[PDB]
Design an enzyme around this catalytic site. Structure first.
Site, PDB file in Angstrom:
ATOM      1  N   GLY A 148      18.003 -23.496  16.479  1.00  0.00           N
ATOM      2  CA  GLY A 148      18.661 -22.233  16.709  1.00  0.00           C
ATOM      3  C   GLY A 148      18.415 -21.764  18.134  1.00  0.00           C
ATOM      4  CB  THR A 149      20.499 -19.716  20.420  1.00  0.00           C
ATOM      5  OG1 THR A 149      21.685 -20.515  20.424  1.00  0.00           O
ATOM      6  CG2 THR A 149      20.285 -19.111  21.798  1.00  0.00           C
ATOM      7  CB  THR A 150      15.393 -19.898  22.780  1.00  0.00           C
ATOM      8  OG1 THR A 150      14.137 -19.234  22.956  1.00  0.00           O
ATOM      9  CG2 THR A 150      16.258 -19.721  24.018  1.00  0.00           C
ATOM     10  CB  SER A 175      16.739 -18.966  16.423  1.00  0.00           C
ATOM     11  OG  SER A 175      16.548 -18.384  17.700  1.00  0.00           O
TER      12      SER A 175
END
Lengths: 244, 222, 198, 250, 244, 241, 204, 243
Positions: free
Chosen positions: E30-32, E75
């Site tokens: 997941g996107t930081t 995330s």
């Protein structure tokens, strides 16, 4: 996913068989030998108390021969628990039927009643069947005495006499040998007892190893009378067979 | 009907008549409106006698179960709760009225409830028709710190007031003493001033006085 | 109300039903059947709530045959009467109870006997020599109490019927437009066509 | 979510067997050996109170539990399974019997009723059979004292006396040795002590052992007085004292 | 045996659910994204990865708000948290509907953790592939929470999730040491921006966009709102300077 | 609550459960029926694996759904019963609803779906029974012969057999029966039936059980004697050469 | 429109000496119309008997219900029911109807087989349990009944005295109700045996 | 077949490994906690471990106040803890609601144990891998200690501990209690009892503890509550004195 865990009870064999039904039947082989006979004048019920012991209490104990109604009692081949379920239900069903028509249920109706109920688990539900089959002993107005049977598959037939549990073929042979249509109850009684004693897998055929019952229109009657014999009575008639 | 109860010093006792009625007609000359919820929790009821008995049986059953389930002794409150909790759900359409009392680990307790869930509490309680008669007896002679006998005596007479001065109240006196320390004691027909005199005549019949069209014997067993 | 008449004579049951049909002011059908055949030996006659008395009737009729063919068997009227009452017992406590009042005539084969049951919409059942519904019996039972004998033959009651009918013909305000006369016996059911003249 | 195990979890073996049951029996056999004895004057049941730690307070765990003032039960197996069944048993008794009949069912029916449950576990999906079997004793008016044994099979039958759990075989062996019809409870009580002593490995005393009887009605235990008809419970549980008292009587 | 992971609710031989643990896999993937509880309140910072020019700036928005005082960011798989978020939006609504108050962050925190854990409780229920950093100002101050598919969340002086969380967790730890006092939301805004770029250095391979939102007892009064425009641009260049 | 889908397209697009049900059908004791010009006759082999049974109280492999319409089958006696049941309800329903007993087809099509349903029904297996349906339509004497199978498919047959060995006797029937000449006489139709029967039954009278639908709810099952008399006759004509 | 009043008819029980006597009229009718002089309001389960007054179809219906239940009981019980058990059963059944209630006056009486004790009981329509040691009355003429019974009754009559007693009690009371009439039946009930009798009366 | 491992059904040996694996997730959080009935009171001491600054330590607890009277400490996954506590919390009020008085501690445990027992028997339900510890001062029982497992199994305790080194703490107290012969601490002030336990906690753990190190809760008559770090430190002060 849940799929991993399903035994998938009702699925067909590649040969179109239901192994649970097969195996239920198989456990029934292991079930205590139970026999019944439609005599001319009545119907006899005798079954071997199986897995017995000294401190086992016999008298109250009935593990096999149960009475659905005063014109319908049954012998049980299978799990004691499972039948009692069906036992209770049928009674209600009969009672309902009675309470419906104020008249007793022609046995097959009750029989076919349980028949499809077993079949209920057969064709749906992912539910194991009952490991139980039955001797259906009943008297009706229509056919008089009626001796039926059932299998966990729910398939069911009538009989002049029949046996279930272990040694069936042996009994069946002995029965299909020694039986004759006109047999009186008391003959069939011993005849079974004969078959029992012989088909007995244990050493001796003894009352404490047996459940016994009869459906008979008594001499003073008009009420076709079911009777389960007391252990002594069984033990008594046990002697009358000369089996002693 | 007159049902009463009085918390006394060490506990509480309840009383009610043995008179049961169908309208103007006495249904039961001697009945018992007092009923055990638990050995130490007892209740009598007014309004529908069927209801009173019916619900009572139900609750104590739960109470017992709950008591067993708790494996602790019942507490009047839990019953008290269930009742209104039960009753109020029925919008009072179950018309039972209850003086409920009991001694428990928490102590002695005395409670009155009505069909709709109204629950009241006080040292002395009386319900039913002649309750007012009793309530008078209550209001007059109730004092704080009643003994057993004070509880006995006071409750004794309040019933009588109903017995005497209430048509729905009479017949005999039922008493269940519930004391914190001890087992309860249920005194049936504890007082029976109402004993009927001997009939001025014996009306027993000479046999054959009746014309019997037909006779037969009903079989019992099979 | 209509007119449902029945009699269990010695060996047979005769069932009579007013033939009229009325909605409000009009007599719609004077030829009407108010009865339904449950089985060859079981006939049921009924009066009551317009839609219901039809609906319930045929409804039960299918039921028995269904059971009948199920068991390939013709039931005792007793059971049938027993059964029907049960329906009413429910329906009377149903949301929209039937209003129906029935005579089940039947000839028990096993007994070789006619059987005549009356059941109200309340579902109160009794088997009788003879019976009626609503205003019907109010005139008749006297004659029946007067004349009736169990032994009385198939033909005899019919006469007694006609008299009783005539009474109703006389004493009842509403024209019933004749009656149907059917007979349950060992042969089961047949309608006598000629009665008003008989 | 939404249990999708609707399918019977235990299925008949190619040999026609139900393994879970068999394994239940296995687990049941693993159960702490527990016994029961139906004497003339009454019935007694007994089991060893198992302490998995002295920090734990044994009494806070009851393997014997009254179902009805004349009926109480005991098991050999997983405590928790026994626990919940008790409540149901208690409940169904009130509901399906008392709340109908206003009283406490004859030992058989309740037993018959209980076993019904255990069967259901075997059959219905999503559930497993219970890890216990039950020694159940009760006195009723007509059938008097009776002693029953219920399996995860939901099968049940009477006994003159019996034991379940591990040493039960050895017990029942000695039981058959010891048992007669005419045994009065106290001797039977003493007998059980003797018997269970064998099944007992660590300390043997009322604090290690759980005893109760189906006795005569106990008006003291009735919790109230004034009712002639009800003389109280026939069941009672025995004190470590009473136990250790009779453990002197050993 | 094996394959314990292959069904959710199953306990591993060591008593674990690898599905959740596998769900945790994409969580890292997941996107930081990070979150900060400043002095009065909290700040929510997330990198918006720019996949292409066809993406329209500012339009696809990650951080989601629950009620008006509670922002949330996660995330993981976007539709998951979103689905969850809605339920939270439901929860507070019900809560406020019942309680007339906006929900306390911890209250709100708890309710979800159950609902997440619920998805640990069944082999048919797919755990959540997200971990939400969430919080806001409530009756007592603010709170900063990040809930795991494990059903575990905690109070966080600072919180980070997704790929670059380490670079984040570094910087967060620092500011804790830099500012055990607390922090001004403004600096909370500013520092996160740096952290994000720093966190982006893991994902540095692609350009992104920076979305930051915040809940300030002071500045948003306790509302939860985005950082926008100059103040947004401030922290950018503030970081875009400091990144060098 | 148990929805699990048992009936599913095979990799090659088959439902083996259906295909296995066909086996219990084959496993099922053979059943046959043929339609005479005015009439239809239903032969069935009594499962002979056992005996000493009371056949009176033991149901017939053939059964009546409605006074003018009967059914026979091959498969599990259980599965039939339910099938047997609903159809019976159905006719009565149709009787009630439509003021009329069904057309043989109507219930036939009805019953078919029931099977056909349980196919794409989940949580249930299909029946293991294939059936033969006999009856003469309301106000129509015409023979109506219908064959159904767990796949829920039905059709009309000049004659048809089902169960074990049905192919064998079918070959007999295919040649032995002629469409241009239905065995108009019930007996000859019965005769042709029993001829076809011993082709499988392997020498039994009791082992055989017969039923005939005539017009207008005229339906009759035949006694072993009647059977044997045909058995006797048939044997002769064979023996004669 | 009292469903009790529509049928009418009445039922009484008494406790004799070591015996019990139950009775009802045989009349049935709709309002002023009488219908079945042959109708019977009492029924018996094992040794336990039940008369009921009220809406008849209910009585009819209930009569099954208990007979329905009794067997289920008895079969499970492997023995007949005792009244006091059956007593609960009825009240339960009735109060089960608490807002669905039947219109019934049911009266239960028997001799407890174990204790050998005679027993009677009587109910409202929702199952309020009225138990007396003398007599229980039910039906529209109940008012008459007390007049007869409470006056006539005395403890522990011998069955026939009891019979003769309950007889005139019933007979006279019957005439004083319109709805009760057309013959009367009595079960003279002893620990062993039960005697049924029919009683001549006014057929108006 | 081998799915018996995966689901809840008797092993060929009649065993539930999902259960036994749930017994793993118990000490998985690796917190050694204890509970002791004091004289009038009951005290629970537990390790409060904070791995990270960025956490809110104050938010970290396995000791949960179920009722006014009943606190509960949990050993196992915090979600199940956060799960189970609510379940309990639901009960008491409802119990209190239904039954008019607060649920005595055991009943809760007894109640909660059933759930596991349900989960135990139910398949699609997994059990929770937490062990629960129920204490409070029961008006009837005064101090009381109850600890439930994923098996639905539970019992009273004179005292008890839970954790990886639970075994040793068990021994320590057993020794101490055998030495004392009395079920509960004689100390009237839970304060001492706290210090007493922490001692034996420090003792049987051989490990010293700071104010943050310990999770602590105090069962008192009619009230359960948890101490501050100050109270902790306050106890830590006096223990440094006696020891």
């Amino acid at each position: 996913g849940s799929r991993r865990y399903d035994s998938r009870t009702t699925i067909f064999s590649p040969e179109g068989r239901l192994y649970q039904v097969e195996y239920a039947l198989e456990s029934i082989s292991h079930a205590g030998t139970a026999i019944g006979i439609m005599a001319s004048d009545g119907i006899v019920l005798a079954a071997e108390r199986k897995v017995t012991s000294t401190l086992l209490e016999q008298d109250t104990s009935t593990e096999k021969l149960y009475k659905l109604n005063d014109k319908i009692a049954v012998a049980v081949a299978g799990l004691t628990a499972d039948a009692e379920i069906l036992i209770n239900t049928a009674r209600i069903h009969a009672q309902n039927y009675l309470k419906t028509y104020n008249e007793d249920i022609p046995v097959e109706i009750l029989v076919r009643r349980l028949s499809d109920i077993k079949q209920g688990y057969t064709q749906h539900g992912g539910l194991r069947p009952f490991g139980v089959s039955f001797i259906y002993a009943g008297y009706d107005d229509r056919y008089g005495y009626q001796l039926y049977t059932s299998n966990p598959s729910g398939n069911y037939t009538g009989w002049k006499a029949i046996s279930v549990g272990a040694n069936t073929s042996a009994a069946q042979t002995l029965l299909q040998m020694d039986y004759k249509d006109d047999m009186k109850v008391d003959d069939a009684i011993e005849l079974a007892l004969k078959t029992l004693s012989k088909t007995t897998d244990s050493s001796a055929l003894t009352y404490d190893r047996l459940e016994f019952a009869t459906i008979r229109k008594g001499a003073n009657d008009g009420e076709v009378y079911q009777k389960i014999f007391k252990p002594q009575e069984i033990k008594d008639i046990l002697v009358k067979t000369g089996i002693t | 009907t007159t049902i009463v109860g009085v918390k006394f010093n060490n506990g509480v006792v309840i009383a009610a008549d043995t008179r049961s009625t169908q309208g103007p007609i006495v249904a039961d000359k001697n009945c018992a409106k007092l009923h055990r919820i638990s050995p130490k929790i007892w209740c009598a009821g007014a309004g529908t006698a069927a209801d009173t008995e019916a619900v009572t049986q139900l609750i104590g059953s739960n109470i017992e179960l709950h008591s067993l389930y708790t494996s602790r002794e019942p507490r009047v409150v839990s019953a008290l709760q269930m009742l209104k909790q039960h009753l109020f759900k029925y919008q009072g359409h179950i018309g039972a009225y209850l003086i409920v009392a009991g001694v428990d680990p928490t102590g002695s307790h005395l409670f009155s409830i009505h069909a709709h869930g109204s629950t009241d509490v006080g040292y002395y309680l009386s319900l039913g028709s002649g309750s007012l008669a009793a309530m008078a007896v209550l209001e007059s002679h109730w004092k704080q710190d009643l003994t057993k006998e004070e509880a006995i005596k006071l409750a004794s007479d309040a019933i009588q007031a109903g017995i005497w001065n209430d048509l729905g109240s009479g017949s005999n006196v039922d008493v269940c003493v519930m004391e914190i320390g001890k087992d309860a004691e249920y005194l049936r027909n504890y007082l029976t001033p109402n004993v009927r005199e001997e009939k001025q005549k014996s009306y027993k019949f000479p046999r054959g006085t009746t014309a019997v069209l037909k006779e037969s014997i009903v079989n019992i067993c099979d | 109300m209509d007119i449902i008449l029945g009699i269990r004579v010695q060996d047979s049951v005769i069932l009579a039903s007013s033939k009229a049909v009325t909605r409000g002011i009009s007599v719609l059908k004077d030829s009407d059947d108010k009865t339904r055949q449950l089985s060859p030996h079981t006939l049921m006659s009924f009066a009551g709530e317009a839609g219901d008395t039809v609906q319930f009737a045929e409804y039960i009729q299918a039921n028995i045959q269904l059971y009948s063919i199920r068991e390939d068997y013709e039931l005792s009227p007793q059971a049938v009467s027993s059964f029907v009452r049960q329906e009413l017992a429910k329906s009377i406590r149903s949301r929209r109870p039937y209003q129906v009042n029935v005579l089940i005539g039947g000839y028990d084969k096993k007994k070789n006997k006619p059987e005549l049951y009356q059941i109200d919409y309340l579902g109160t059942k009794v088997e009788l020599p003879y019976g009626a519904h609503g205003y019907s019996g109010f005139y008749t039972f006297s004659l029946l109490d007067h004349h009736y004998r169990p032994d009385m033959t198939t033909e005899e009651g019919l006469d007694l019927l006609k008299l009783c009918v005539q009474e109703l013909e006389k004493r009842m305000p509403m024209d019933f437009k004749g009656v149907i006369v059917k007979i349950v016996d060992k042969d089961g059911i047949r309608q006598v066509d000629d009665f008003q003249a008989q | 979510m939404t249990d999708r195990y609707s399918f019977s979890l235990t299925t008949f073996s190619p040999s026609g067997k139900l393994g879970q049951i068999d394994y239940a029996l296995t687990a049941v056999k693993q159960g702490v050996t527990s016994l029961g004895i139906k004497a003339t004057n009454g019935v007694v049941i007994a089991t060893e109170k198992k302490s998995s730690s002295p920090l734990a307070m044994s009494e806070t765990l009851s393997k014997v539990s009254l179902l009805t003032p004349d009926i109480g039960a005991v098991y050999s197996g997983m405590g928790p399974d026994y626990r919940v069944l008790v409540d149901k048993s208690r409940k169904v008794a009130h509901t399906s019997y008392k709340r109908i009949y206003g009283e406490y069912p004859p030992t058989k029916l309740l037993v018959s009723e209980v076993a019904k449950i255990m069967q259901e576990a075997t059959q219905s999906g999503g559930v497993r059979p219970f890890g216990v079997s039950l020694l159940i004793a009760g006195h009723d008016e007509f059938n008097g004292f009776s002693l029953y044994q219920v399996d995860p099979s939901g099968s049940y039958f009477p006994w003159k006396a019996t034991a379940i759990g591990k040493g039960s075989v050895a017990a029942k062996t000695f039981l058959e040795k010891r048992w007669n019809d005419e045994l009065e409870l106290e001797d039977a009580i003493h007998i059980a002590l003797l018997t269970l002593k064998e099944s007992v490995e660590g300390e043997f005393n009322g604090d290690t052992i759980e005893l109760a009887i189906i006795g005569d009605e106990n008006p003291d235990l009735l919790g109230y007085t004034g009712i002639p008809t009800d003389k109280g419970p026939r069941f009672r549980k025995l004190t470590s004292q009473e136990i250790n008292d009779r453990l002197e009587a050993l | 045996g094996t394959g314990y992971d292959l069904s959710n609710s199953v306990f591993s031989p060591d008593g674990r659910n690898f599905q959740v643990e596998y769900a945790v896999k994409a969580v890292e993937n997941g996107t930081t994204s990070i979150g900060i509880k400043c002095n009065d309140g909290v700040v929510f910072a997330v990198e918006k990865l720019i996949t292409s020019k066809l993406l329209v700036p500012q339009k696809n928005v990650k951080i989601q708000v629950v009620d008006r005082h509670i922002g949330c960011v996660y995330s993981g798989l976007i539709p998951d948290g979103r689905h969850l978020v809605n339920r939270g939006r439901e929860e507070a609504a019900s809560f406020k509907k019942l309680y007339k108050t906006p929900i306390p962050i911890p209250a709100f925190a708890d309710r979800l953790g159950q609902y997440v854990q619920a998805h640990t409780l069944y082999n048919s229920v797919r755990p959540f592939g997200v971990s939400t950093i969430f919080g806001g100002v409530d009756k007592n101050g603010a709170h900063l929470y990040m809930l795991e598919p494990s059903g575990s969340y905690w109070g966080y002086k600072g919180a980070a999730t997704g790929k670059g969380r380490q670079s984040a967790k570094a910087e967060l730890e620092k500011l804790v040491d830099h500012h055990p006092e607390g922090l001004s939301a403004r600096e909370a805004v500013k520092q996160a921006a740096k952290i994000i770029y720093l966190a982006h250095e893991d994902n540095k391979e692609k350009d992104f966009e920076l979305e930051i939102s915040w809940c300030s007892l002071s500045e948003t009064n306790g509302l939860h709102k985005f950082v926008k425009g100059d103040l947004l641009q401030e922290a950018i260049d503030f970081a875009q300077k400091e990144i060098n | 609550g148990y929805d699990r889908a048992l009936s599913i397209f095979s990799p090659d697009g088959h439902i083996f459960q259906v295909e296995y049900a066909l086996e219990a059908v084959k496993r099922g004791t053979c059943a046959v029926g043929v339609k005479g010009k005015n009439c239809v006759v239903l032969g069935c082999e009594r499962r002979s694996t056992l005996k000493l049974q009371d056949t009176r109280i033991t149901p017939s492999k053939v059964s009546k759904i409605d006074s003018h319409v009967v059914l026979s089958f091959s498969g599990l006696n259980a599965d039939s019963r339910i099938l047997i049941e609903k159809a019976r309800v159905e006719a009565q329903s149709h009787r009630l609803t439509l003021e009329d007993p069904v057309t043989v087809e109507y219930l036939t099509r009805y019953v078919a779906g029931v099977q056909q349903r349980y196919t794409q029904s989940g949580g249930v297996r299909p029946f293991g029974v294939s059936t033969l349906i006999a009856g003469f339509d309301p106000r129509d004497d015409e023979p109506k012969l219908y064959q159904t199978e767990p796949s829920g498919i039905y059709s009309s047959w000049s004659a048809q057999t089902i169960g074990r060995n049905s192919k064998t006797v079918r070959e007999f029937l295919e040649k032995n029966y002629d469409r241009k000449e239905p065995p108009a006489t019930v007996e000859e139709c019965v005769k042709l039936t029993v001829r076809s029967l011993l082709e499988v039954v392997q020498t039994g009278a009791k082992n055989i059980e017969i039923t005939v639908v005539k017009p207008d709810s005229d339906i009759v099952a035949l006694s072993s004697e009647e059977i044997n008399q045909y058995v006797t006759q048939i044997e002769q004509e064979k023996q004669e050469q | 429109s009292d469903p009790s009043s529509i049928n009418g008819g009445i039922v009484v029980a008494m406790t004799g000496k070591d015996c019990v006597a139950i009775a009802c009229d045989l009349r049935l009718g709709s309002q002023s119309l009488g219908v079945s002089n042959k109708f019977e309001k009492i029924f018996h389960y094992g040794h336990v008997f039940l008369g009921i007054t009220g809406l008849a179809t209910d009585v009819t219906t209930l009569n099954e219900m208990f007979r329905y239940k009794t067997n289920l009981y008895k079969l499970k019980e492997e023995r007949a029911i005792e009244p006091e058990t059956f007593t609960q059963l009825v009240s339960s059944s009735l109060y089960e109807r608490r807002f669905g209630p039947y219109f019934v006056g049911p009266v239960v009486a028997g001799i407890n087989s174990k204790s050998g004790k005679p027993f009677i009981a009587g109910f409202d329509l929702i199952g309020c349990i009225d138990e007396a040691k003398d007599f229980i009355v039910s039906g529209t003429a109940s008012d008459q009944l007390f007049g007869m019974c409470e006056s006539l009754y005395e403890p522990n009559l011998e069955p026939e005295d009891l019979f003769e007693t309950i007889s005139q009690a019933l007979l006279n009371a019957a005439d004083r109700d319109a709805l009760s009439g057309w013959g009367a039946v009595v079960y003279i009930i002893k620990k062993d045996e039960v005697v049924k009798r029919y009683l001549k009366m006014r057929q108006d | 077949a081998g799915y018996d491992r995966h689901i809840t059904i008797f092993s060929p040996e009649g065993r539930l490994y999902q259960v036994e694996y749930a017994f793993k997730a118990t000490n998985q959080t690796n917190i050694n906690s204890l509970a002791v009935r004091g004289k009038d009171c009951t005290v629970v001491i537990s390790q409060k471990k904070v791995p990270d600054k960025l956490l809110d330590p104050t938010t970290v607890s396995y000791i949960f106040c179920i009722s006014r009277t009943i606190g509960m400490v949990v050993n196992g996954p915090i979600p199940d803890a956060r799960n189970a506590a609510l379940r309990a919390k639901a009960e008491a009020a409802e119990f209190r609601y239904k039954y008019g008085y607060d649920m005595p501690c055991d009943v809760l445990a007894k109640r909660m144990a059933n759930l596991s027992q349900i989960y135990t028997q139910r398949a699609y339900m997994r059990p929770l891998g937490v062990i629960l510890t129920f204490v409070s001062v029961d008006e009837e029982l005064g101090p009381s200690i109850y600890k439930t497992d994923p098996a639905g199994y539970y019992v009273g305790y004179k005292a008890t501990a839970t954790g990886p080194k639970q075994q040793e703490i068990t021994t320590n107290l057993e020794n101490h209690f055998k030495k004392s012969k009395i079920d509960h601490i004689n100390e009237e002030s839970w304060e001492k009892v706290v210090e007493f336990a922490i001692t034996h906690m420090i003792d049987a753990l051989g490990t010293e503890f700071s104010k943050n190190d310990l999770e602590v809760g105090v069962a008192t008559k009619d009230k359960f509550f948890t101490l501050s770090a100050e109270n902790i430190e306050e106890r830590l002060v006096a223990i440094a004195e006696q020891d």
